[PDB]
């Protein structure tokens, strides 16, 4: 088979370190085409408590550039100034017809506090099991719409909630600088511990494992 | 009174300190228990008013050894 040698070099008793198993992820996977990395990091959150939700925009400190097509909901001069930041479809309620069709070309929605009457009155159900974000909790809607997507369209990966403990994020292209990604995983620690919701349980992070796509299993540590 | 036969534990007095350091004169009573012991040398029942740690002395020493010290102090058993 091709699913047996994968289960050979996975030792759950030996929790791997930073420099040990992440650099050898190119040999643990026998993938055909060009793939990438994933990152799974847990945070203790009960399912029936609403004061434990951990969300926010994470500015990644490097791999992929402008890759995600993100929309703009602005009025006035910001409808022609946010186009310089890399967005394709910038406008108004003409983009609400694309919401009614259910277009999955967009993944992230960014607006500004003057077109917040558009998403809050038309994109009600389809925007958020759509899960498109528009928060003052996160930095989704500032009034700095010129300088939003100069780095957020490039390297920002959005933190979503789950019913359980899990917060899975995405790693970058396999042939990047692997010394920087191990610090990118180390600087996702300071972002997830930046909010200590102050009602956390016993641990902060129990299990943190970064898999590539479907083959590698790399058990990391929460301390280092 | 409340005195152990083996070790001689008369109840001491102390304070019942609350959270606001309020003193109240309580009295620490020992963990006494009227137990009936068996002696191989005498081959009969011996009932002494020992404490909880007094049986721990009998756990180490022999029961014939402890009553030898009772005789040299004017104790009735």
């Amino acid at each position: 088979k091709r699913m047996r040698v994968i289960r050979e070099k996975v030792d759950a008793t030996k929790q791997y370190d930073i420099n040990e198993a992440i650099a050898l992820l190119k040999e643990l996977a026998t993938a055909k085409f060009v793939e990438s990395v994933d990152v799974a990091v847990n945070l203790g959150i009960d399912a029936r408590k609403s004061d434990q939700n951990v969300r926010g925009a994470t500015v990644l400190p490097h791999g992929t550039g402008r890759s995600v097509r993100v929309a703009v909901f602005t009025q006035g001069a910001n409808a022609e100034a946010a186009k310089a930041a890399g967005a394709e479809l910038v406008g108004m309620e003409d983009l609400a017809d694309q919401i009614k069709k259910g277009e999955m070309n967009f993944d992230v929605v960014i607006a500004s506090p003057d077109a917040m009457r558009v998403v809050g009155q038309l994109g009600q159900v389809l925007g958020p099991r759509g899960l498109m974000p528009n928060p003052k909790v996160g930095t989704v809607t500032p009034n700095v719409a010129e300088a939003v997507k100069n780095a957020k369209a490039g390297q920002v990966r959005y933190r979503n909630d789950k019913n359980g403990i899990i917060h899975t994020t995405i790693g970058k292209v396999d042939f990047d600088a692997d010394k920087l990604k191990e610090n990118l995983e180390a600087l996702l620690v300071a972002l997830k511990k930046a909010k200590p919701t102050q009602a956390k349980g016993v641990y902060i992070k129990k299990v943190s494992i970064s898999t590539t796509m479907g083959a590698g299993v790399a058990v990391d540590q929460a301390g280092l | 009174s409340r005195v152990c036969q083996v070790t001689g534990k008369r109840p001491v007095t102390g304070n019942n300190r609350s959270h606001a350091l309020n003193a109240t004169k309580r009295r620490f009573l020992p963990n006494l228990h009227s137990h009936r012991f068996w002696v191989e040398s005498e081959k009969r029942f011996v009932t002494l008013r020992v404490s909880a740690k007094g049986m721990r002395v009998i756990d180490k020493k022999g029961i014939d050894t402890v009553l030898a010290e009772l005789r040299a102090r004017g104790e009735k058993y």
Binding site: K136, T139, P142, V144 | -
Partner: protein, 50 residues
Amino acid sequence: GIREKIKLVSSAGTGHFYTTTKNKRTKPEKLELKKFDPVVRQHVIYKEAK
């Protein structure tokens, strides 16, 4: 009441810090002001923290 306080941590090697007040619920981004440092005697850009 509304306007809480922040701590401007120096991005240099020193442990010196300025402190000031910033209303978080109006402009939620960090401050990147550029003031004097009495330890390094440089003009280091300061970063926002708690």
